[PDB]
C-alpha cells in the first residue's frame, strides 16, 4: 500500500522464551509475520511471536518485562524467507497495533 508503515505491527525483539500467557495459534507451511499478525489480531492479542520457521504464538504481555533477549532468531519464515521466524530456541516478537 505504502512502502513503509503499511504493516499494523511493530517488531519488539528476539527473545529466549515467552511468558506463560503466550499460546500457539498455528503451525503453517507459509508462516510469516503478516500471517501471524492476522491470526493473532483475530484473537484480540497484543503481541505475536514467530518460532522455528513455521509456528505462530499469540500473547498479551510484553516479553521485555520478563524474558531475556536473544541473538539467535535465525530460522527463516517458510512463507517469507527474508524474514526470520524466530529460531530453533528463540522467538521473534512483535506488537500488534
Ligand atoms: Cl528504511
Ligand atoms: Cl507484505
Residue numbers in the entry: 14 to 110
Manuscript text:
Here, we solved a high-resolution crystal structure of the extracellular cysteine-rich domain (CRD) of yeast Wsc1, which shows the characteristic PAN/Apple domain fold with two of the four Wsc1 disulfide bridges being conserved in other PAN domain cores. Given the general function of PAN domains in mediating protein–protein and protein–carbohydrate interactions, this finding underpins the importance of Wsc domains in conferring sensing and localization functions. For this purpose, we determined the high-resolution crystal structure of the CRD of ScWsc1, revealing a tightly packed globular core domain stabilized by four disulfide bonds. Our Wsc1 CRD structure reveals an unusually high number of surface-exposed aromatic residues that are conserved in other fungal CRDs, and can be arranged into three solvent-exposed clusters. The protein surface of the CRD contains three aromatic clusters that are conserved in the CRDs of both ScWsc2 and ScWsc3. Mutational analysis demonstrates that two of the aromatic clusters are required for conferring S. cerevisiae Wsc1-dependent resistance to the glucan synthase inhibitor caspofungin, and the chitin-binding agents Congo red and Calcofluor white. Our mutational analysis reveals that these surface-exposed aromatic clusters play essential roles in conferring sensor function under cell wall stress conditions, indicating that they might be involved in eliciting appropriate cellular responses via the downstream CWI pathway.
In the yeast Saccharomyces cerevisiae and other ascomycetes, the maintenance of cell wall integrity is governed by a family of plasma-membrane spanning sensors that include the Wsc-type proteins. These cell wall proteins apparently sense stress-induced mechanical forces at the cell surface and target the cell wall integrity (CWI) signaling pathway, but the structural base for their sensor function is yet unknown. Further studies have demonstrated that ScWsc1 function requires the presence of the N-terminal CRD, which can also be inactivated by mutation of its eight cysteine residues that are a hallmark of this highly conserved domain. Purification of ScWsc1 from yeast cells in lipid nanoparticles and transmission electron microscopy have recently provided the first broad three-dimensional model, which confirms the proposed tripartite organization of the sensor. These studies suggest that ScWsc proteins may act as mechanosensors that detect structural alterations of the cell wall by their extracellular CRD and STR domains, and, upon stress, undergo extensive conformational changes, which are transferred to the cytoplasmic tail, and trigger activation of downstream signaling components of the CWI pathway.
